[PDB]
Enzyme design. Structure first.
Site, PDB file in Angstrom:
ATOM      1  CG  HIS A 117     -52.216  71.892  17.494  1.00  0.00           C
ATOM      2  ND1 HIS A 117     -53.160  72.158  16.526  1.00  0.00           N
ATOM      3  CD2 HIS A 117     -51.023  71.855  16.855  1.00  0.00           C
ATOM      4  CE1 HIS A 117     -52.564  72.272  15.353  1.00  0.00           C
ATOM      5  NE2 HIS A 117     -51.266  72.093  15.525  1.00  0.00           N
ATOM      6  CE  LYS A 136     -69.242  17.212  34.766  1.00  0.00           C
ATOM      7  NZ  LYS A 136     -68.993  18.556  35.348  1.00  0.00           N
ATOM      8  CG  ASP A 145     -61.272  66.732  22.450  1.00  0.00           C
ATOM      9  OD1 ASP A 145     -60.787  65.588  22.322  1.00  0.00           O
ATOM     10  OD2 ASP A 145     -61.616  67.436  21.480  1.00  0.00           O
TER      11      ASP A 145
END
Ligand SMILES: NC(=O)c1ccc[n+]([C@@H]2O[C@H](COP(=O)([O-])OP(=O)(O)OC[C@H]3O[C@@H](n4cnc5c(N)ncnc54)[C@H](O)[C@@H]3O)[C@@H](O)[C@H]2O)c1
Ligand SMILES: NC(=O)c1ccc[n+]([C@@H]2O[C@H](COP(=O)([O-])OP(=O)(O)OC[C@H]3O[C@@H](n4cnc5c(N)ncnc54)[C@H](O)[C@@H]3O)[C@@H](O)[C@H]2O)c1
Ligand SMILES: NC(=O)c1ccc[n+]([C@@H]2O[C@H](COP(=O)([O-])OP(=O)(O)OC[C@H]3O[C@@H](n4cnc5c(N)ncnc54)[C@H](O)[C@@H]3O)[C@@H](O)[C@H]2O)c1
Ligand SMILES: Nc1ncnc2c1ncn2[C@@H]1O[C@@H]2COP(=O)(O)OP(=O)(O)OC[C@H]3O[C@@H](O[C@H]2[C@H]1O)[C@H](O)[C@@H]3O
Ligand SMILES: Nc1ncnc2c1ncn2[C@@H]1O[C@@H]2COP(=O)(O)OP(=O)(O)OC[C@H]3O[C@@H](O[C@H]2[C@H]1O)[C@H](O)[C@@H]3O
Ligand SMILES: Nc1ncnc2c1ncn2[C@@H]1O[C@@H]2COP(=O)(O)OP(=O)(O)OC[C@H]3O[C@@H](O[C@H]2[C@H]1O)[C@H](O)[C@@H]3O
Lengths: 473, 473, 473
Positions: free
Chosen positions: C152, C385, C114
Site C-alpha cells: 500500500h 575432567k 510504518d
C-alpha cells in the site's frame, strides 16, 4: 596542536557560520569511499569488460555506463543490480559522519546513493528528513533536525539513480525542483563541499547558472580537496604537471567564489571537523561549585570574584550552565544578569536548580548528567558544604568532575578557591597528559597559576578567561 | 583451457547468481534433442503428408498441427498418440541434465514434454516438484530441492500438451496462473535460457508483458544460442544473410534485456556448465593433515603458518571443511575464528571431528567420504602421527588423498610441510597430467614452488592461495 | 500453561510450515496499533470535520478521504502531510515484531505504512528487502533474509500511499505486479494474517481472483481475529448480534480457505507467537558434558548410554549441537552417525570442537556462546575432567550451564550421571520456579527422576526424551 593559518581561518569562519545555523554540507561520493565501499570505477569494471572497454583506460564513467546501456537497447538491469548490491551493504560509520551528525547543521546535499548520512543522523537521536524524489519536497517531516537532499537518488531505488548520460541529460527536466532548491541553497547558505570532485555535470550547470545570475556578488562557499601526491612509480615532471593542473582547477573553482582548502591527507578532514565541533562544543561552560566557606578571601570578596568571573564569561560570548549550587549559583546569576541587562536568552544562562527532597535525589544523577552533557568545558570553584554542623567537602563537585571527565570535557579546577577544588587541581596536575594531552608551555603556566593563591580577583579571573580561550580556540 | 572473454564474464556472473540461489534455468526442446529424441518436425512429417503438406517446406509447425486438427474436425488423437509414443521412450540422460541437477538451482521452466529434467534431479537424490497443471501450483512438495514448471504439458498427459494453435490461443485463459508465475520469476530471478529458440508465442507474449511493465529496468537474463554454420551445399551470400539475420535476432533479444552468448558448438554448452559447476564445486576446500612434528619449522612457527593459511583461505571467500585432525585442526579453527570474528556461519567452517574408539573407527571410512564429498579442492599438510612412541607416517592423510582423487577433486599436497605430504607431492609430480590435465606454465611453477622448503610462511601461503585461485577460476 | 485445542493445532501446523520456510506473514494496520500509533479514524477526524462530516458516524474511511480530495479539486496535500507526520514517529517496537523477526520467515506482506517490520528485521541483524514500488520488484537485495512487500506504500512516500478511493480504483492498473506477486504467494505459501480486518478492497479482489482460479483446491491460510467483547454501555441483544455477525464473517473468510483462530485478547497474539518460536527454538538441543569417570556405570556402559541417548534424540527429529567434549562428544557423534546412516545434513549434527592451545582459550568464551546461541535446550551429562593427575570437576560444564541460563534456554541437568551434573541438578531443584516457571506434576516427576541413579540406560533415556518433548511441545 594547530594547522596552517589558512585552515585556521576557514575553521573560524565556518564555526561562525554553523553557530548561526546558516551552514550546509555538500557531501560527494568521496566522503563514503573511506567507509569501505568500492569506488564507482571498480563497480563499473565488469560492465566495461562486457562491452569491450576498460575502466582503467577510461576517464568518463558516465559515458561508459551510457555505452553499456546503448549496447543493451537502453536497459539498466545490471547497473541497478550492481548499485543496489554494493551501496546497500552493512558497513560501520566513519568519524566524519558522526561529527557531521553532532554538528548543528540543518541541510545536507549528497550525490552518494548510500544512507550513511541518514544513519549518522539517526544514531545521534536526530530526526532526519531524507528527500530524493520530487514529490517528497512538498512534505516536511515535523520537528526535523536536518534535511538530506539526495540529489542523485537513493540506493533502495536503483532505477532512479543518476548513473548514465541520459539521466544527466533529462535531469534538468525531471528533477528541476531539486535544481531550483540547490540554486536557492547555494545563495542563502554557506556550503562546505567535502569529498566532492566538482566534475559532476549537474553541479557544473547549477554553479554556472548561479554565477550567471549573481556575477561577482556570489556567496562564499568552502571546499576541501586533497593535494596531489606522487604515485609510487612516476616521473617528477608528470607529478609537477599534475600539481599544476590541480592548482589551475582550484583557481577555477574560486570563479564561482568557492574557496578551496588544500589538505595534505584525507585524515586531515577528521581533524578539521573535530576542531570545528570543539570550537562549538567548548562555547558552553559549566560553573560547578558550592561554598559555605570561601578560603583565604572573605565571603563578600569571593562573592565579588564569582560575580565578576561570570560577568567576564558572559562578556566573552560564553554560555553559562549552572546547577544553582549553594554559594556560587546566586552570584553566577547576579553576574550574568548584570552583564546581560546592561530579557534573558535561553542560550546565555541556563539554570538547573536541583530538586530538594528524597524524591529528587534519586533523579539527581541523571539531572546532573543532562546538565553537564549540555556543556563543553567545566570550571570548578571551592566545593565545600555544611554538614552535621561542620564544613565538610562537597562530593557533588567531585561527581560533576567525574561526569565531565567521562564526557571528555575540558576540566578547569580553580585551585585558588581551595577545598575540593584544590584536590581536583592536584589530581589534574599529577597526570597532566591524561586530562590535557598535547599541552603547550602557556597552558601549563596558566594551569600552574590557577593555584596561585596570592593572585587578586582580577588576575585570577584573567587567568581563567585566558585558559578557557586557549581551550576553545 | 579457457574460452572467450564474453563467455568468461557470463560464467563469473552466473556462478555469482547460482551461489545465491537466485538463478533459474529455462530449458527448451533443444536441450533434449541431443539425448536422442527426434525433432518435432520429424514427428509431424507423417501428419503433414496426411493433409497434403510437407514439413520441409513449412516454417510454422504450430499452424501445421492446427491444419491437421481442422481437417479431422478438431480431433487430436493422432497427435496425442505421436507425442506419447515419442517422448516417453527410455533414453539415457545427457551430461547437461546431470550437471544442471548437480547445480544448486531451485527453479526450472521447461517447454519440453519429456521427463529428462525430473529424472536427472531424482538421480542426484534431489526431491523435485514437477508442476504442469494449474491445481498443482497450490500444493508444494515438502522439502523440495527444485521445482520444474512444465509450462507446456507433460508427456504422460498428451491431451494437455500445447501443440496446436488453439492451445496457444486459449493458453492465456486456461493456463493464466503459469503465465503469472513465469512473469514473477522473470523479474525476481536470473534466467539462463538453454536450448531455446525464442519463437514460442507464449514466451513472446510473457516477455512483451514484462517489458511493458518494467521498460528499461528489467532484470538481466542470459541465453545460449549457437552461431549459424554453413550448410554442406550453400552459397556464401546466403550464409552471410543467415548470419546477419541471426545477429539481428540476437540484438532483438536484448530488447528484453536477455544477453545472448554466441556458442560455436553445441558441445560448448557442456563446457560452460562444467565451468559453472567447477567455480562452485571448488569454492570449498578440505584442509587435510595431522602433525606431531613440524619438519624444518618449530611447532610455534608451523602453528602460525596453519593459522594464517586458514585465515587467508576464509578471507578469500572459501569454505573450510576440517576433520579436526591432531595438529592442524585446532589451528585451522583458530584462524577461521580470528578471521570471522573480526557468530559462525554453517557454510564457512564445517567441523567433523572423528569419533575416538573402536566403535567409531568402523564408521570412520564413510565419515571421511562424507566429509570429502562436501568439498571440491583438497590441501594436504604434513601428515605424521605418534604411534608406538615414534613419529610414524599417518595413513589417514593418504586415505583422504585417495578418496579426494577418486572424486576428481583437485589435490594440492603442500610438500614444504614434509612427511606424507612430501610423498604426496612427489606422487602428483611424477605423473602431472594424471592429476592436473592441461596445466599451464604458471600452474607448474606454483606446484614446483609448493616443495620449496626455503620459502617463508607468507610466501608459502601466497603460493597456496594463488594455486587454489587459479584452480577455482 | 496451554491454550484451546484449536489454537494448539494451529500452533503445530504453523510451526511445521515455518520450519520448512514455506510460511508468510500478512500484517495489517492492527499489528502496529498496539505500538502507539493513533488509529486511521483518529487521523482522519480533522479531515472529516473539515468537509462537514464526522468519523464516528462514518463506516467507510476510504470514501471519507475521497470526499475530502473531491472538495479540494483532487489534492492530497493535507492527507500526505498527516500520514507522514503520524507514521514516521519514533516509537519502540512491540514484542510481536521482534518475535516475527526472530522467526525463520522470508516473506512479509504489509498494508501498514510504518517501517516497524523493517526495523524489527534490522535489529536482529537480518538483511531485509523492503519493496513498495513496481520498479523495486525487478531488483533483489543480495543475501536477503526476508522481503517485505509494502503493498500500500511507504510512510516516506506519502503521495504513493493507498488512502483514497481513486487509489484503490487505479491500483489494479498501476500496481498490477504487486497483485500478481500476492496471487502467487497466496497459492505457493501458507499465510498467517495477523492484525488484518479483511475489509480491504484490494485483498477482497485478490482473494476472489484466487478462489475463482483454484475453486476448492486453494491452499490453507491461517488468520488471527479477536472475538467481539461487550462495550461498557451496550444491551445484551446488540452484543449477541455483533457476535453473530462476527461468526458469519469468520465463516465467510473460510470460503477462501482462510481458517480463523478466535482470540480472547489481543495479548494472546504474543502468547501464540512465543509458542510458535519456542516449538522452533527448542528443536535444537545442546549436549554438554565431559567425562573421564562415569560414576556408578562402567566406561562401556556409560558410552552406550550416551550413544543411545544421541541416537534417540536424532530419531525424534532433534538437532544436536556438541562441543566435542572429552568423553561425550565422540559417543554423541557415534550415535548420530548410527541413526543417520541407517550423508550428514548440516542441521542434524553440528560439531564445534574447541581449539586446543593458549591462542584458542582466549576465544573459547565467544565460541561457547556462539554454540549455545544456536540451541534452545541444554542437556548436561557428568562434567568431570582429569587435572593434575586427579579427577577434578570440569568448570566448562558449569560455564555452559550459566551461558544457557543467561539465554533463557531450558536446562536439563542429568543428575544420574553425577559430578558437576548432580550439582547442577541440585541447584535447579532448590529453586525450581526460577528455571522452570509454571511447571506441572509430570514435569516435576520427570525432573526428580533425572536423579534416580537406580534407573537403567533405557529408563533414563526415556525420562530425558519425555522431558525434552514436554519442553518443546
Ligand atoms: O563524482 P564524486 O565527487 O561524487 O565522486 P568521486 O569518487 O569522483 O570523488 C572524488 C573526490 O572525493 C575525495 N575522496 C576520494 N576518496 C576519498 C576518501 N577515501 N576519503 C575522503 N575523501 C576522498 C577526493 O578528494 C576527490 O576530490
Ligand atoms: O521451440 P523450442 O525452442 O522449444 O524447440 P526448438 O526445436 O525450436 O529448439 C531450437 C533451439 O534449441 C537449440 N538446439 C537444437 N538442437 C540442439 C541440440 N542437439 N543440442 C543442444 N541444443 C540444441 C538450438 O540452438 C535452437 O536455439
Ligand atoms: O484495514 P486494516 O485491517 O489494515 O486496519 P484496521 O485498523 O481496520 O485493523 C483492524 C484489525 O486489526 C486488529 N487490531 C486492532 N487493534 C489492534 C491492537 N491494538 N493490537 C492487535 N491487533 C489489533 C483487529 O483485530 C482487527 O481485525
Ligand atoms: N536549600 C537549597 N536550595 C537550593 N539549592 C540547594 C539547597 N541545598 C543544596 N542545594 C544545592 O543542590 C545541589 C545538590 O546538593 P548536594 O548533592 O549537597 O551538592 P554538593 O555536593 O554541594 O555539590 C555541589 C554541586 O551540586 C549542585 O548544587 C548542590 C547544592 O549546593 C551544583 O551543581 C553544585 O555545583
Ligand atoms: N585424541 C584425539 N582427539 C581428537 N582427534 C583425534 C585424536 N586422536 C586422533 N585424532 C584425529 O582423528 C582422526 C582419525 O585418526 P587417524 O586415523 O589416526 O588419522 P591420521 O591417520 O592421522 O589421518 C589424519 C586425518 O584424519 C583426521 O584426523 C585424525 C586424527 O588426527 C583428519 O581428517 C586428518 O586430516
Ligand atoms: N585433547 C582434546 N581434544 C579434544 N577436545 C578436548 C581436548 N582436551 C579438552 N577438550 C575439550 O575441549 C573443551 C574445552 O576444554 P575445557 O575448558 O577443559 O572443558 P571442560 O571444563 O571439561 O568443559 C566441558 C565442555 O567444554 C567442551 O569440551 C572441553 C574439553 O572436553 C564441551 O563443550 C564440553 O561440554
Amino acid at each position: 596542536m594547530k594547522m596552517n593559518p589558512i585552515v585556521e581561518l576557514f575553521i573560524k569562519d565556518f564555526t561562525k557560520e554553523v553557530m548561526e545555523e546558516n551552514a550546509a554540507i555538500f557531501a560527494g561520493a568521496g566522503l563514503s569511499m573511506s567507509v569501505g565501499y568500492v569506488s564507482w570505477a571498480k563497480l563499473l569494471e565488469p560492465i566495461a569488460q562486457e562491452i569491450g572497454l576498460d575502466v582503467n583506460k577510461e576517464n568518463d564513467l558516465v559515458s561508459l555506463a551510457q555505452y553499456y546501456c546503448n549496447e543493451n537497447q537502453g536497459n539498466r538491469g545490471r547497473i541497478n543490480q550492481i548499485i543496489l548490491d554494493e551501496f546497500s551493504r552493512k558497513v560501520d560509520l566513519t568519524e566524519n559522519h558522526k561529527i557531521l551528525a553532532r554538528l548543528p547543521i540543518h541541510t545536507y546535499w549528497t550525490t552518494a546513493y548510500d544512507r550513511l548520512i541518514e544513519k549518522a543522523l539517526e544514531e545521534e537521536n536526530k530526526i532526519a528528513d531524507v528527500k530524493y524524489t520530487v514529490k517528497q519536497l512538498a512534505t516536511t517531516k515535523v520537528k526535523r533536525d536536518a534535511v538530506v537532499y539526495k540529489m542523485h537518488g537513493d540506493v533502495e531505488h536503483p532505477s532512479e539513480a543518476v548513473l548514465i548520460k541520459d539521466d544527466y541529460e533529462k535531469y534538468s527536466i525531471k528533477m528541476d525542483p531539486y535544481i531550483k532548491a540547490l540554486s536557492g541553497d547555494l545563495v542563502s547558505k554557506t556550503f562546505l563541499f567535502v569529498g566532492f570532485s566538482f566534475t559532476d555535470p549537474n553541479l557544473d550547470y547549477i554553479l554556472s547558472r548561479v554565477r550567471s545570475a549573481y556575477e561577482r556578488d556570489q556567496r562564499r562557499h568552502y571546499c576541501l580537496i586533497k593535494k596531489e601526491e606522487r604515485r609510487p612509480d612516476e616521473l617528477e615532471a608528470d607529478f609537477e604537471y599534475r600539481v599544476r593542473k590541480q592548482e589551475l582547477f582550484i583557481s577555477d573553482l574560486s570563479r564561482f567564489n568557492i574557496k578551496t582548502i588544500v589538505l595534505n591527507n584525507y585524515n586531515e578532514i577528521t581533524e578539521i571537523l573535530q576542531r570545528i565541533e570543539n570550537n562549538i562544543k567548548t562555547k558552553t561552560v559549566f560553573l560547578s561549585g558550592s561554598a559555605v566557606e570561601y578560603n583565604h578571601w572573605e565571603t563578600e570578596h569571593a562573592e565579588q570574584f564569582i560575580h565578576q568571573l561570570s560577568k567576564e564569561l558572559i562578556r566573552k560570548d560564553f554560555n553559562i550552565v549552572s546547577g544553582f549550587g549553594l554559594g556560587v549559583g546566586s552570584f553566577v546569576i547576579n553576574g550574568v544578569l548584570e552583564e546581560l541587562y546592561m530579557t534573558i536568552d535561553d542560550d546565555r544562562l541556563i539554570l538547573r536548580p536541583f530538586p530538594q527532597g528524597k524524591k529528587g535525589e534519586e533523579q539527581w544523577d541523571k539531572y546532573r548528567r543532562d546538565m553537564i552533557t549540555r556543556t563543553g568545558v567545566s570550571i570548578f570553584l571551592y566545593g565545600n558544604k555544611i554538614d552535621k554542623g561542620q564544613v565538610v567537602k562537597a562530593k557533588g563537585v567531585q561527581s560533576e568532575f567525574n561526569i565531565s571527565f567521562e564526557q571528555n570535557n575540558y576540566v578547569v579546577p580553580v585551585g585558588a578557591t581551595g577545598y575540593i577544588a584544590k584536590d581536583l587541581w592536584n589530581k589534574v596536575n599529577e597526570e597532566f597528559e591524561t586530562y590535557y594531552p598535547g599541552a603547550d608551555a602557556r597552558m601549563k603556566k596558566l594551569f600552574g597559576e590557577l593555584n596561585n593563591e596570592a593572585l587578586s580577583i582580577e588576575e585570577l579571573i584573567n587567568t581563567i578567561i585566558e585558559f578557557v580561550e586557549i581551550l576553545s580556540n
